Amino acid sequence: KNPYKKYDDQQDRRNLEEPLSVNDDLYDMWSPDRFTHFKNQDALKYFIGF
Amino acid sequence: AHVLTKDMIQERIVALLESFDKVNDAKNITATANLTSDLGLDSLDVVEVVMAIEEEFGLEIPDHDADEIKTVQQAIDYVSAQPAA
Amino acid sequence: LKDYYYNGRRILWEIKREGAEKEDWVNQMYFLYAPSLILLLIVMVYKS
Amino acid sequence: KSALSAVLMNRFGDAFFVLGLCVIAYVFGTLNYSTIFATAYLINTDLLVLIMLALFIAAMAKSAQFGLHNWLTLAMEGPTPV
Amino acid sequence: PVPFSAANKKLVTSMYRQSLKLARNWISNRQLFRQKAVEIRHKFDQNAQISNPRLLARTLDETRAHLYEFRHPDPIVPPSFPGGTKYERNVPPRMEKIMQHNLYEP
Amino acid sequence: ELKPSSAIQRGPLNKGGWDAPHALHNDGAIDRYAHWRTFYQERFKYTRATGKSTLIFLVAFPALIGYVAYQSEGLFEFAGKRRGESVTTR
Ligand SMILES: CCCCCCCCCCCCCCCCCC(=O)OC[C@H](COP(=O)(O)OCCN)OC(=O)CCCCCCCCCCCCCCCCC
Helix, strand or coil, X not given: CCCCCCCCECCCCECXXXXXXXXXXXXXXXXXXXXXXXXXXXXHHHHHHC | CCCCCHHHHHHHHHHHHHHCXXXXXXXXXXXXXXXXXXXXXXXXXXXXXXXXXXXXXXXXXXXXXXXXXXXXXXXXXHHCCCCCC | CHHHHXXXXXXXXXXXXXXXXXXXXXXXXXXXXHHHHHHHHHHHHHHC | CHHHHHHHHHXXXXXXXXXXXXXXXXXXXXXXXHHHHHHCCCCCHHXXXXXXXXXXXXXXXXXXXXXXCCCCHHHCCCCCXX | CCCXXXXXXXHHHHHHHHHHHHXXXXXXXXXXXXXXXXXXXXXXXXXXXXXXXXXXXHHHHHHHHHHHXXXXXXXXXXXXXXXXXXXXXXXXXXXCCCCXXXXXXX | CCCCCCCCCCCCCCCCCCCCCCCCCCCHHHHHXXXXXXXXXXXXXXXXXXXXXXXXXXXXXXXXXXXXXXXXXXXXXXXXXXXXCCCCCC
C-alpha cells in the first residue's frame, strides 16, 4: 500500500474498521519483508547462478 | 539548529522561479500568481516546477497533491505545513 | 465504610496526595513471606 | 524488525554452539580449555569434524559469512556509535 | 485512451514525474542528469501530437512498460519521509490522562 | 393451580462493584477474525491440502524419526576416544 494516504494507523497502513484477510499475519506490517523488484523464480535462478 | 519562516519559503520560491526560463516575466511574479495562466506554463512545465520545488526543499510529495498546488500561495502554504526542511 | 473510602479515592482523608498509603497485603508479605523466603536461601546455601 | 532479524540470525548459530558444547562435554568430559587442549591430539578426525562443524556454524552465524549474512546490513537502523 | 482532458493530463503528469524520478535515483553527475532530463523532456514534447485514441493508447502502455523496465532498487527518499532512515525516530507520545481500571487501587 | 409459593420475594442478581470505563475500543473486524480463528475446528474439512499435511506430519514424519531412532540405537559410544579406534558398535 502507499504510505501517503492518511490511514488511521500510519504504522500499519490500515483503516479503523477494515476487514482482515483469511490468513492475515503473512500480510501484516509485522509480516516478512516481501521484495518487489525481481520475480522470486528469477531471483532463485540468479542466486544459484552466482 | 535551523528553523525556516514564511518569508524564507517566499524568497526561495521567488528566486526559484526567476531561475526558470519558460516563465513569462520576472516582474509579474507574486504570491498569488497562477503558474498555469499568469506565468504561461504548460500542462507539463508546471510538473517540472513542482519537481524543482520538492528537490530544493528536501521534501518529497505524492501525486495526490502535485496538482493541488496550482498557485504560488498554495505551494507556500503547503510547504509551511511540513516540519521537514 | 470501605466503599465510601475507595469510591472517594477514585473520583477525588480524601483531598490530599501523599505516598504511599499502606495496603492490606504488605504486612504479611514483607514480614512473613519475604524473611522466610530469605531464610530458605540461607539454609540452602549452608546445607550445601 | 531488524532486531528480530539480527537476534534470530545469531540464535541459529547459538543452537549449533549448544550442539557442539554437548559434544565437548561428552568427548572430553570438560568445558575447561586446559584439559581439552591437553588431550585434543588423541581423539580422531571423525569426531573433531563433528565438533568444529558445529563450532564453525556458530561462528559463521555471528562472524557473518555467506550462509547467513543479512543481519549486518540489516543492523543499520541502529545509530552510528552502535 | 482519450484526448485532451483532465483524465489524460493527470496520467501523463504522473508518468512524467515518474520518468524524471526514475532517472534522478539512477545516475550521479548532475550535468549528465540535466542533459538526460532535457532529452526525456524532448521525448514527451515530440510525441504529444497524437490525434487518434488507438495509437495514443499504444504509445501510452508502451511507455508505461518502458518506464516499468528501468526501475531502481532503492529510490532516493528523504530521510524524514517513509522510505527514509529518520522516519519515526521519536514520535511524540499523545497527551493522555490515565484511564483507570480498578476501584480499589490504583 | 401449581405455582411456586407466594413467600419468595425473589429479586435481581447483581455482580457488584465498580463500572470501569472503557479502555479499549473493540474493532468488529478483528473481533470476528479472532472468533473465526479460535473456533476454526468446527468448520474444518478434509481437502487435498489438509490431507497432504495430515499425511506428512502424522504418518510420514513419525515413521522417519522411528526409522532413525530404532536403527541407530546403541551405535555410538563417544566417551573417551583414540585414533583408528571404532567409533560405532555395529
Ligand atoms: C549447510 C550449512 C548450514 C548453514 C546455514 C545455511 C543457511 C541457513 C539460512 C536459514 C537460517 C537463518 C536463521 C533462521 C531464522 C530466520 C529469522 C529471520 O530471518 O527473521 C527475520 C524476519 C524479519 O526480517 P525482515 O523483515 O527481512 O527485516 C527487514 C528489515 N528491513 O522475522 C520474522 O518475522 C520471521 C519469523 C519466522 C522465522 C523463520 C521461521 C522458520 C525458521 C526455519 C527453521 C527451520 C526449522 C525446521 C526444523 C526441521 C528439523 C527436522
